């Protein structure tokens, strides 16, 4: 039994339908997330380019999901927005019910469970998205999670998804000290990212970023989706014209 339908099972226990989608990912912009013992980093390279496209009073790669949680997309634009929406809702029901912030582990799980849902019933196709989840909860502190359309999630030290994430992947395996303070990461981010590009060079416009950090002076957690400026600048700091 070959290709078609998700409800089909190949003679060897394979769900092709899935395996295609689970691979469809290799078409989206390279997104990366990294962990540090003081903050989490989400880096991403934009796609769909031309010269007549804004991106400032919008985004489409880095979405803030909770005041304490964030995600990096890499799949079908149409899909993502749907999950992103119900992911936000549910997170709020947790708040409205327990009057407390929803734990990252939990949130990731529920989502992976919907993606999995569409993986087993006739009349619907699986979501073709991949997410890098980054957030904090006082239960297990900082956390970097990931999930594919197969509905599996994973704890990572620092990961990438999308394009060339095999190449990009290995670059990471080299430089990474577990404690590695944030700036070294933000820096590392670009280093890893530049190296894996079809553009003549890395231009701010075609790029997305954000970070998470918390402390004693904040007493709580603060996250920042970086605006057009800050980027055009830190880029120079890492020595880029």
């Amino acid at each position: 039994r070959y290709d078609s339908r998700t409800t089909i099972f190949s003679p060897e226990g394979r769900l092709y339908q899935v395996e295609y989608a689970l691979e469809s990912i290799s078409h989206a912009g390279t997104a990366i997330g990294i962990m540090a013992s003081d903050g989490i980093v989400l880096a991403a390279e934009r796609k769909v380019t031309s010269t007549l496209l804004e991106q400032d009073t919008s985004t489409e790669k880095l979405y803030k999901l909770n005041d304490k949680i964030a995600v990096a997309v890499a799949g079908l634009t149409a899909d993502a927005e749907i999950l992103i929406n119900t992911a936000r809702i549910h997170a709020q029901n947790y708040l409205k019910t327990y009057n407390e912030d929803i734990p990252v582990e939990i949130l990731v799980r529920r989502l992976s469970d919907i993606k999995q849902g569409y993986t087993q019933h006739g009349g619907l196709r699986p979501f073709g998205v991949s997410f890098i989840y980054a957030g904090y909860d006082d239960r297990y502190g900082y956390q970097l999670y990931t999930s594919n359309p197969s509905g599996n999630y994973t704890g990572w030290k620092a990961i990438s998804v999308g394009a060339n994430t095999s190449a990009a992947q290995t670059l990471l395996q080299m430089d990474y000290k577990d404690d590695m303070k944030v700036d070294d990461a933000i820096e590392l981010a670009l280093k890893t990212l530049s190296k894996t590009t079809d553009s003549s060079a890395l231009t701010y416009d075609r790029l997305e970023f954000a970070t998470i950090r918390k402390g004693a002076n904040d007493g709580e957690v603060y996250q920042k989706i970086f605006k057009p400026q800050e980027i055009k600048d830190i880029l120079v700091k890492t020595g880029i014209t």
């Binding site: 409800t7 190949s10 993986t119």
Partner: protein
């Protein structure tokens, strides 16, 4: 004739068969019992290790204070079963006070795996599972295996997943049907060596979880599991 909800000439439902082919694709689990314990062993697909040790998952799962289970096959699936089981575990206790019988539990689980093989427009769980525990106010160790089709079965010791066939053989000529492994200590000793076939060195790929009566339970630590690899390689060299 493969897209099952129909019969082969010889009366087969090939889909349901193929699904089992995935449980083999997956990781590996093995359970053993004594006259006081029931140990559950599993391996660890330590493959792309650049991920936090801490919070990332581990095969054995508690379903109620006195019962746990393990699997092999699709993780993606497995999770959903565990959840639905855990739920029924309470729905019972609520509407009946008395906490669940391990036999009952399995039957419920198997009923679900069974539900996903009837209506057209749904596909079977690519998961086979081992469920162990001790009944309420009871000291008789219980071991059951459930698989994709919907069949449940009680075993003295069984294994599933890739290379189960092997270790199974091993077990077959080790586990004494007449008398089960007495002490807990050695009941473990057993299971551990039975996994050493597929492991390929390192207690870094071996998970042990132990269950006693009166809702006691307890997973194992790495060194603990190591002090066994040790005290076994020793007697292997002594043969």
């Amino acid at each position: 004739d493969r897209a099952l909800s129909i019969f082969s000439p010889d009366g087969h439902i090939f889909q349901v068969e193929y699904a089992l082919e995935a449980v083999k694709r997956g990781t590996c689990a093995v359970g053993v019992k004594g006259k006081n314990c029931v140990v559950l062993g599993c391996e660890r697909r330590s493959t792309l290790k650049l991920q936090d040790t801490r919070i990332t998952p581990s095969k054995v799962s508690k379903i109620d204070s006195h019962v746990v289970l393990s699997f092999s096959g699709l993780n993606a699936d497995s999770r959903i079963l565990i959840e639905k089981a855990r739920v029924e575990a309470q729905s019972h206790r609520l509407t009946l006070e008395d906490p669940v019988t391990v036999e009952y539990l399995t039957r419920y689980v198997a009923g679900v795996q069974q539900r996903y093989t009837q209506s057209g427009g749904v596909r079977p769980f690519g998961v086979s599972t081992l469920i162990a525990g001790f009944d309420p106010r009871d000291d008789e160790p219980k071991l059951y295996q459930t698989e994709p089709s919907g069949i449940y079965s009680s075993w003295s010791a069984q294994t599933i997943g890739r290379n189960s066939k092997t270790v199974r053989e091993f077990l077959e000529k080790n586990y004494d049907r007449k008398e089960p492994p007495a002490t807990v200590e050695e009941c473990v000793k057993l299971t551990v060596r039975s996994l050493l076939e597929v492991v390929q060195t390192g207690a870094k790929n071996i998970e042990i979880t132990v269950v006693k009566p009166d809702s006691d339970i307890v997973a194992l630590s790495s060194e603990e599991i190591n002090q066994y690899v040790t005290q076994i390689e020793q007697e292997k060299q002594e043969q």
